[PDB]
Design a protein around this ligand. Structure first.
Ligand SMILES: C=C(CC)C(=O)c1ccc(OCC(=O)O)c(Cl)c1Cl
Ligand SMILES: C=C(CC)C(=O)c1ccc(OCC(=O)O)c(Cl)c1Cl
Lengths: 208, 208
């Protein structure tokens, strides 16, 4: 089945967990404590010396986006054709780019950079509002009329930014409605409300 | 029916150009000068305000990795099955991570950071040598027995690092042989030796 090996935080596993939950998939959580990680052996066995580590049978994967694409590919959440698949990648790449800036702020310089980051936020979110407006008026998903792995990753990105900058989605009606709509999906709603998700910190350094 | 819109540098288009050339594909180059870019209109029309922009018929793509995955998917350079496809993604994600560090060094802190970067390089290259050793003794490609988009991206990464740190591949026999081998592919060899590639700077700020 599936096993996700990660630190006791949402971080880069939040999106893939939402995907698994919403798709009614069963998985195992292997929690890595800071003490275990600092021991060194685990880190050394990780391909790029990082987590998450993912196991699907005897297939061992590293890199959050590789895991998302793998699940999207095997679970049929990667567009209806090659054209949609490319657009899904384009959205995910954009989500990844903003995620990198977010992580840099959180772990590198939260105190000094928070204000500039928040001022620049609207410009960073606009592309996703635009994509939504060009797809069935933003009434369905980020790409096409079926959910994709990019939806889960984008949803997570939006959720964590609302925590960082409450109200950042007020200027974007499509993204706002999108978050509410996806968050309302039965299995996803149940997961997002569960202790498994709720009692885990977004990040590892206590900042959000 | 392919069109690459980019600045007059190799940068993030080097790998996809190598792919197109080696696969015997025809494409058009739309060069964007710094003056044109600074005018603002083009940038504003780009999804994430960045290049490269790619056109395949009426499909317009942004993000170098989206373009690579699109071409890999449509040209059959994405593994023989889902398992290999995941491995290809894992390699490409790793290449992207090192590329980001490389770009950061080149554009934001070349002078002061070059030494630390080069010292850390072997550790960054090791994962790729390891992947190679686990696949047919590193005699074929990075994943499986057929070329993938990840090979072109990794090859580019290796080539630009040889320029940055001559001899960095001396400690990695599989990667060294890999570079020589792939660079020897007829169409790729011809392209790499052509003015089209040779007369373009690796980066935009004159550093390499
Ligand atoms: C070092 C840590 C404890 C083992 C830590 O707190 C930490 C640092 C960076 C991180 O992500 C970085 C990313 O790029 O996602 C994460 Cl997820 C954690 Cl938990
Ligand atoms: C600003 C420039 C001229 C229009 C410039 O020189 C420049 C800066 C960053 C770049 O890549 C960044 C990357 O992330 O790939 C590139 Cl490819 C260029 Cl040409």
């Amino acid at each position: 089945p599936y096993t996700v090996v990660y630190f006791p935080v949402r971080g880069r596993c939040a999106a893939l967990r939402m995907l698994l939950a919403d798709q009614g998939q069963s998985w195992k959580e292997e929690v890595v404590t800071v003490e275990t990680w600092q021991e060194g052996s685990l880190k050394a066995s990780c391909l790029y010396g990082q987590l998450p580590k993912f196991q699907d049978g005897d297939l061992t994967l590293y890199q959050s986006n590789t895991i998302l694409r793998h699940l999207g590919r095997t679970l049929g959440l990667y567009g209806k054709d090659q054209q949609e698949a490319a657009l899904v990648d384009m959205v995910n790449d954009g989500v990844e780019d903003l995620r990198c800036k977010y992580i840099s702020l959180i772990y590198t310089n939260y105190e000094a950079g928070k204000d500039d980051y928040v001022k620049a936020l609207p410009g960073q979110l606009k592309p996703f509002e635009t994509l939504l407006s060009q797809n069935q008026g933003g009434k369905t998903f980020i790409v096409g009329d079926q959910i994709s792995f990019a939806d889960y990753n984008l949803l997570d990105l939006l959720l964590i930014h609302e925590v960082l900058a409450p109200g950042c989605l007020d200027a974007f009606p499509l993204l706002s409605a999108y978050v509410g709509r996806l968050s309302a999906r039965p299995k996803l709603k149940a997961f997002l409300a569960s202790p498994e998700y709720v009692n885990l910190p977004i990040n590892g350094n206590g900042k959000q």
